[PDB]
Amino acid sequence: MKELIYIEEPKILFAHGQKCTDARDGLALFGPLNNLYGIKSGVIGTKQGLKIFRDYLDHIQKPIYNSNSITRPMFPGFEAVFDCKWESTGITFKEVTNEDIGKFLYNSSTHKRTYDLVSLFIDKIISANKNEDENVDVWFVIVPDEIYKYCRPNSVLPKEMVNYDAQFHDQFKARLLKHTIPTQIFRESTLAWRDFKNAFGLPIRDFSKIEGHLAWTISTAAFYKAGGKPWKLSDVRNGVCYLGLVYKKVEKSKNPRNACCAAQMFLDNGDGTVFKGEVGPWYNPKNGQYHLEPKEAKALLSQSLQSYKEQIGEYPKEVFIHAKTRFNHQEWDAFLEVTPKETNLVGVTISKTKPLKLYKTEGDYTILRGNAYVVNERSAFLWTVGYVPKIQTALSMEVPNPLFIEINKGEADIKQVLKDILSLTKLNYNACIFADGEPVTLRFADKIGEILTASTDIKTPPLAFKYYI
Amino acid sequence: KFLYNSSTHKRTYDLVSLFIDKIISANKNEDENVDVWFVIVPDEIYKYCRP
Amino acid sequence: NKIFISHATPDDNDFTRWLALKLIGLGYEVWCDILFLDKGVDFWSNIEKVIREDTCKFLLVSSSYSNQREGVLKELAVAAKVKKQLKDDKFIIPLAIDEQLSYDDINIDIVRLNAIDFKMSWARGLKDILEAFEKQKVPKEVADASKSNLLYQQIFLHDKSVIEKEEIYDSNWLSILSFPEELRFHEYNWMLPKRFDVRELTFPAVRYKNYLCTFAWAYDFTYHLPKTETYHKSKTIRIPTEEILSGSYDSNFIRNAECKRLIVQLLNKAFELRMKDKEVQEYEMSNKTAYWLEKGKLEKDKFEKTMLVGKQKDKNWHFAISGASKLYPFPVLMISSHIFFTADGKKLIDSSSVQHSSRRRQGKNWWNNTWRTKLLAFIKYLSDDDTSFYLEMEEKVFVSNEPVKFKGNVSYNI
DNA sequence: ATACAACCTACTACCT
RNA sequence: UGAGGUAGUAGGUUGUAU
Numbered sequence: 001m002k003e004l005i006y007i008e009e010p011k012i013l014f015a016h017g018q019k020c021t022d023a024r025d026g027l028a029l030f031g032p033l034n035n036l037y038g039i040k041s042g043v044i045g046t047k048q049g050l051k052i053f054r055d056y057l058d059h060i061q062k063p064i065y066n067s068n069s070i071t072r073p074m075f076p077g078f079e080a081v082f083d084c085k086w087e088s089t090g091i092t093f094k095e096v097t098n099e100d101i102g103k104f105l106y107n108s109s110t111h112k113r114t115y116d117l118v119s120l121f122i123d124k125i126i127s128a129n130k131n132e133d134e135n136v137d138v139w140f141v142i143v144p145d146e147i148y149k150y151c152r153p154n155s156v157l158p159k160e161m162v163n164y165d166a167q168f169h170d171q172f173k174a175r176l177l178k179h180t181i182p183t184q185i186f187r188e189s190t191l192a193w194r195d196f197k198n199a200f201g202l203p204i205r206d207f208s209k210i211e212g213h214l215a216w217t218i219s220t221a222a223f224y225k226a227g228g229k230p231w232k233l234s235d236v237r238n239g240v241c242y243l244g245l246v247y248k249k250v251e252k253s254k255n256p257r258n259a260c261c262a263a264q265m266f267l268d269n270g271d272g273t274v275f276k277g278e279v280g281p282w283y284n285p286k287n288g289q290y291h292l293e294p295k296e297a298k299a300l301l302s303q304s305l306q307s308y309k310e311q312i313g314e315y316p317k318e319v320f321i322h323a324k325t326r327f328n329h330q331e332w333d334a335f336l337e338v339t340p341k342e343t344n345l346v347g348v349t350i351s352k353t354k355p356l357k358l359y360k361t362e363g364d365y366t367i368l369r370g371n372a373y374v375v376n377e378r379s380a381f382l383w384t385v386g387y388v389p390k391i392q393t394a395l396s397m398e399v400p401n402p403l404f405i406e407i408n409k410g411e412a413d414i415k416q417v418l419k420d421i422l423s424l425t426k427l428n429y430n431a432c433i434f435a436d437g438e439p440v441t442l443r444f445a446d447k448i449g450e451i452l453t454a455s456t457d458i459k460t461p462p463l464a465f466k467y468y469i
Numbered sequence: 470k471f472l473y474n475s476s477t478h479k480r481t482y483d484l485v486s487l488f489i490d491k492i493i494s495a496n497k498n499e500d501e502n503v504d505v506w507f508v509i510v511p512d513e514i515y516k517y518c519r520p
Numbered sequence: 521n522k523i524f525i526s527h528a529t530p531d532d533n534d535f536t537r538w539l540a541l542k543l544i545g546l547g548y549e550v551w552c553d554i555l556f557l558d559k560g561v562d563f564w565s566n567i568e569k570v571i572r573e574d575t576c577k578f579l580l581v582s583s584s585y586s587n588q589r590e591g592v593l594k595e596l597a598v599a600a601k602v603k604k605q606l607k608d609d610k611f612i613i614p615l616a617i618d619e620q621l622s623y624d625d626i627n628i629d630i631v632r633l634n635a636i637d638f639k640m641s642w643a644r645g646l647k648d649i650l651e652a653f654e655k656q657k658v659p660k661e662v663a664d665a666s667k668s669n670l671l672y673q674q675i676f677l678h679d680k681s682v683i684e685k686e687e688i689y690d691s692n693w694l695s696i697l698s699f700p701e702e703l704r705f706h707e708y709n710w711m712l713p714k715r716f717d718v719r720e721l722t723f724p725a726v727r728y729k730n731y732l733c734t735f736a737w738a739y740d741f742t743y744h745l746p747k748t749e750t751y752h753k754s755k756t757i758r759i760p761t762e763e764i765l766s767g768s769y770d771s772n773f774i775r776n777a778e779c780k781r782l783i784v785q786l787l788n789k790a791f792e793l794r795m796k797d798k799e800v801q802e803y804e805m806s807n808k809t810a811y812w813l814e815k816g817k818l819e820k821d822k823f824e825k826t827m828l829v830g831k832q833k834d835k836n837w838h839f840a841i842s843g844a845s846k847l848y849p850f851p852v853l854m855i856s857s858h859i860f861f862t863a864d865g866k867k868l869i870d871s872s873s874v875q876h877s878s879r880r881r882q883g884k885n886w887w888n889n890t891w892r893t894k895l896l897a898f899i900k901y902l903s904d905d906d907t908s909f910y911l912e913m914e915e916k917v918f919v920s921n922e923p924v925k926f927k928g929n930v931s932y933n934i
Numbered sequence: 935a936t937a938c939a940a941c942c943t944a945c946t947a948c949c950t
Numbered sequence: 951u952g953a954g955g956u957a958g959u960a961g962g963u964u965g966u967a968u
C-alpha cells in the first residue's frame with residue numbers, strides 16, 4: 001500500500017504586491033498589475049449582433065451574481081475590478097448585412113463557404129484598420145449561430161437549404177496575423193442565451209446560475225487582449241526558462257507534415273513574467289513521426305536561448321521542455337549541441353493517458369488537488385484536478401484524471417518539476433478560473449499550433465498571445 | 470556604427486532600419502498596447518540624414 | 521475613528537464584504553459584524569457601545585432586504601441618537617445598492633438624506649464614498665493592502681483549507697501476487713503454420729522467431745494441434761519469470777523490454793479468455809473491449825446491495841469494466857469503468873450518438889462513492905475465491921480482488 | 935502485409 | 951467560437967518477426 005505527497009497550492013501575484021490563490025478573488029480585492037485607461041471596442045456583425053453586444057456591455061457594468069457565491073465568486077462589475085472603462089459608448093460599428101451573410105452561407109462546398117465568410121469579415125476588419133481614423137483596441141466579431149454551425153470541418157449543409165482550414169475560428173485568426181489585430185469572436189447565443197430557445201420553450205444554454213462566471217471569463221479575456229496583465233506568478237525561480245513543445249498535423253499541403261510550435265516562459269530583471277510564443281513551426285516531412293530533426297531542434301533551441309539572452313543578458317541556467325511526447329536520443333543530442341556548459345537541459349514528458357483513478361472511501365467528493373504519487377526518481381503522478389477546499393467543489397466532473405509527469409531526459413528533482421507544473425497551471429489568461437489541469441505552456445503552444453497550421457502563408461508570425469488566444 | 474558610413478544612402482538606410490526593427494518587434498512580440506510611438510531623434514542623426 | 525457598516529446580515533453580504541475590504545485596504549478603520557468570526561451572546565451591547573463611542577461615520581446599506589429589517593432599524597435609531605448628540609449633519613450615509621427598492625419606498629429615517637448611488641456602478645459608488653470622506657475630513661491612516669489581505673485570510677478563508685489528517689484512497693489497480701515459475705518457448709518448428717490463428721487457442725500463447733511462447737505445457741495444445749503429440753520436451757527454452765520482472769535478462773537472443781511486452785500480451789490474452797469464461801456480454805469499443813452483465817443475470821442486479829443494472833427513463837443502463845495488464849511500475853491490471861445503454865433488457869442500441877448522449881446525461885449524477893461502489897461490486901463478482909480470482913495460464917495466475925490502497929497525509933473537512 | 939504492445943493526433947458530444 | 955472537465959468516435963507511427 002503506497003503513500004502520497006502533497007504539493008502546496010501556488011500563489012499568484014496581483015496589484016500592490018498581494019499574493020492569493022484565486023485569480024477572481026485577487027482581482028476583486030486588489031486588482032490588475034497594469035493600468036489600462038480604457039478599452040475601445042470595434043463590433044462587427046448584423047444590427048441584431050450590435051444590439052446584443054451593446055446590451056451585454058451595459059449588463060456587464062452592474063454586479064452579477066451566481067447561485068452560490070462560495071463555489072463561484074460574483075462579478076462586481078468591470079470597472080470595479082479592472083479599474084478601467086469598457087463601455088458601450090466607445091463602440092465602433094462595421095455593419096455586415098444579413099443578405100451578404102446569406103449569399104455565402106448556403107454553398108455546396110464547406111471550404112468555399114468558410115473562406116467567403118472569413119474573407120467577408122476580414123475585409124471589413126482591414127479596411128477599418130487602415131482607412132479609418134479612430135483607434136480600436138480589440139475587434140469583437142459577433143457571429144450568427146448559423147455561421148458557427150455550418151462552418152465546421154465536418155459540418156454538413158442540409159440539401160434543402162443549399163489551402164486554409166475549413167474552420168471559421170482558426171482560419172479567421174490565421175488570416176489576420178499579417179496585420180496584428182487582437183480579435184474576440186463571440187456567438188450571438190453566448191451573449192443572448194435567453195433569446196435562443198429549443199422546441200420545449202427553454203434556452204439551449206443555461207447561464208442562469210453561472211452568469212457571473214461568464215462575465216468573469218469574458219472580461220478577463222477582453223482585458224488581456226487589450227494589453228493588460230491581470231496577474232503573474234510569485235514563486236518562480238531565477239535563471240530557469242520553461243519551454244512547451246506541441247506537434248500538429250498540417251492537412252493544407254498535399255504531403256502531411258508535423259509542425260512543432262512552442263511556448264516560452266521566464267522571469268525578467270523587472271520581476272515581470274515574460275510569457276510568449278516560439279513560432280515558425282518547424283515541420284517534419286515524415287507522416288506519423290513527432291520527433292524533430294537535428295537541424296530544426298538546433299534552430300529551435302538557438303532561437304529560444306537567443307530570445308532569453310536578449311531579454312535578460314545571459315544564457316539561462318536551467319531549461320525545461322514540457323512536451324506531450326517523449327524525446328528520442330538524436331533530437332536530445334542535437335539539443336545538447338547548442339546549450340553551453342552552464343545551461344542544464346531537462347526534458348519532461350507530460351501525459352494524461354495513464355488510467356489511474358483514486359476513489360475516496362467514505363465520501364461523495366474526490367481526491368484533494370495537489371496530491372502526488374512519486375512512482376520513482378524520474379516518474380510521478382500529479383492531481384492538478386480535484387477537490388479544492390477554497391471553492392468547496394471539485395474542478396473535475398466525475399473522477400479527476402492524473403498527470404503522469406516523467407523526467408525523460410536530464411537530471412532534475414521530480415518534486416521540483418511537480419511544483420513547477422502545478423504553479424504553471426495558474427497562468428491561463430484565456431479563462432478566469434481556479435487553476436486548470438494542463439500546464440499553461442503546453443496549452444498555449446497547442447493554441448498557437450491550431451492557428452499556425454491553418455493558413456500556410458505565415459512567414460514570420462507575432463509572438464504575443466493576444467493574436468492567437 | 471552606421472552614422473559614419475561614407476555614402477548617405479547606406480547610412481540613412483541602415484540607421485532607419487535600426488530604428489524601425491525595434492518598433493516592429495515591440496509591435497508584434499510584446500503584450501503592451503501602444504497608441505503612438507514617440508521616436509526621439511538626436512541632432513547628429515538629424516543633421517547628417519538629408520539628401 | 522471607526523466607520524460603522526450596517527446591512528442585512530444574511531442577504532447583502534456580497535456587497536458588504538467587498539465594501540468593507542475595500543475601505544480597510546484604503547486606510548480607514550471599518551467596523552462590520554461579518555468581520556468577526558466570534559459574535560458573543562451580548563453582541564448588541566457591544567454594537568450600541570461602538571456606535572455611541574467609536575464610529576465617526578455610519579454607512580447604511582439600503583436595499584429591499586434592509587429597508588424594514590428590525591435589527592437594521594434599531595441600529596438606525598441608535599445612530600440617529602448619536603447623530604443628534606454629536607451635532608453632525610452627515611453622520612448617517614445611506615448607500616443605495618438595490619434597483620428594485622424605489623426611491624419612494626425608503627424608510628422614514630432615511631427618506632430625507634442624500635444617498636450614494638451604487639446601483640449603476642460599484643466603482644462610481646466607491647469613488648463617491650472616498651470623495652465624501654476626504655471632503656468631510658474623516659480620519660484615516662496610510663493605505664495598506666496587507667490589512668485587507670490578512671483580514672480576508674483570517675475571516676473568509678478559515679474553514680476552507682487543508683488539514684493534516686490521514687486519508688485512505690481506493691484505486692483501480694489490481695496487484696498481481698502469483699506468477700508461473702517459468703515461461704516456456706516450445707520449438708514446434710512449422711507445425712502446420714503453428715496454428716496460424718493462434719488467438720483461437722485454448723491457452724494464451726504467442727509466436728516468437730521459431731518458438732511458441734506460453735506459460736503452459738507442451739501437451740496442452742494437442743487438441744487443436746496434433747503435431748505436438750509427438751513433439752518432445754527437449755526442444756524448448758525455459759526462462760525464469762521472476763528474473764525477467766527484476767530486470768536481469770541480457771544478451772542478444774532476446775531483449776528485456778521484448779520479454780516484458782510478451783508477458784503483457786500473454787496476460788491480456790489470458791484475461792480476455794477468462795472474462796469470456798464468465799459468460800457475460802461483450803462490447804467492442806473503438807480501441808478496446810468491455811464486459812457488462814445483462815438485466816436478467818442477477819437477482820436482482822443488486823450484488824452487495826450496490827445495483828449494477830438500472831433504468832434511466834425507458835432504456836436500461838449497465839455498468840461495465842475494461843481491463844488491461846501492465847508491468848510499470850509493478851504488475852497490475854488497469855481497470856476502467858464504463859456505462860452502456862440497451863433499449864431492451866438484453867440488447868444493444870446500434871447508434872453511437874444516442875449511447876454517448878445518454879452516457880453523458882447519466883454520468884452527471886453519480887459521483888465518487890457511486891463509481892467506487894459499483895466498480896468494487898463488479899470486480900468482486902468476478903472473484904473466484906475469498907480474496908483473489910484466477911486466469912488460465914495446468915498453471916494459472918491469481919489476481920487480488922482488493923485494489924491497492926493509497927495513503928495521504930492531508931485532506932479536507934467536507 | 936498479418937498478429938501484438940507502446941505511443942500519437944484529429945474531431946464531436948454533453949455539464950456547469 | 952466565454953472556458954474548463956469528462957467521454958466517445960476514427961486514423962497513424964515505431965522496436966521485433968512471420
Ligand SMILES: [Mg+2]
Nearest residue numbers: 221430431469
Ligand atoms: Mg479566448
